[PDB]
Amino acid sequence: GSHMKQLILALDVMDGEKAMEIAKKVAEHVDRIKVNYPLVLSAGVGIMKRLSEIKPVIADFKIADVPYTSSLIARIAFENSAESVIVHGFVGSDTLREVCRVAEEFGGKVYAVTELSSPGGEEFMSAVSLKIVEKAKEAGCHGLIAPSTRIERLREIRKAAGDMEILCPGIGAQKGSIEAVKYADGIIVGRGIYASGNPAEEARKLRRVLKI
Template sequence: MTPRTRLIIALDVTDREEALAIAQKLGGAVDAIKVNYPLVLSCGLGIIKDIKKYASVIADFKVADIPNTNSLICREAFEAGADGIICQGFVGSDSVEACVDVANKFGRDVYVVTEMSHPGALDFMQAHAFELVDLALKSGASGIIAPATRPERLAEIRRRAENMKILAPGVGAQGGDARKAVEAGADFVIVGRSIYNVEDPYAAAVEFIEQLRQ
């Protein structure tokens, strides 16, 4: 995924019509739309193909299982049209490599979580974030997930991550700042409620894009 606006929309809704309306409004203004389990469980995997009419789709399934199960999940997501998938690294290198192997067959991307954006990530994940970066590099992943809510940590992860793409969630409702995240090394920022829950989502998206271009 090549940065254009650097903005990814987190589509954290469960209603099909609402999801498609948001995608239609914002698809042309963003680099990708991120969907997660609540939407897919509500609407079915077919929602990915419907959203792809408007933008690239990243399946935020945080895949975290044994290699065979990871392979099956990734195959289903890519066959449904996903351009990328997010997996967890804590399950080990063989499980991440299983995701990467399937992604390579489809010409798609895998992003490995190194440190999440919520406070609970400090309990266990933060202590192992650099190890997860190294695992993602060794496994051949396209990129990683690092927190916009902690730009100082994002900067440290950036130095470790070499040329891998960094997607930074937590901008907006969780308190992360889009510009600070990019300055710390993020290639893309992920924003959800702060855009699609306002009166004019398109204007809100444009405002974030302008911040990222300053």
């Protein structure tokens, strides 16, 4: 798009003090911080509250259960200051709707995964990815996760999604295409930022390369 785009740090380290260090030093160059289970299991879910004072936090919990337990997971995420949560579309509309319902209580957002950026995502997810877009839209999801590693599919997802927010992982370690910026609203980068000698410099340079 023509509009301002985000750089989102996937803070996949396994020490909370290290996470805080990295977030603080790259803060000038990143718009939101995505936290996944390796960090939350290592540091405690409370790490999201601490990180949220630096940038808004996406709870990347890949919620993928029946509605009852999915509801509880979403609630815990929002109780711990997450601005948004990530849910798998493949587990069905009932879970999508319930996670969206919990989110609304908190003014939070829900992102539905279409297909993973890894090769494994092609085995089952790719076949239903566009249908997931449809279901996520109908369920009231606020956005989508879609892969930079399959640019032709990312374009197709954008066409099906309209102006729905799309966040794209895969650039850097997974060798995704920087052309993803044409279709994405936010670019997610983990290793390309934190697994470096100078994370702040890498984040700075990524913005330049992506032209965002």
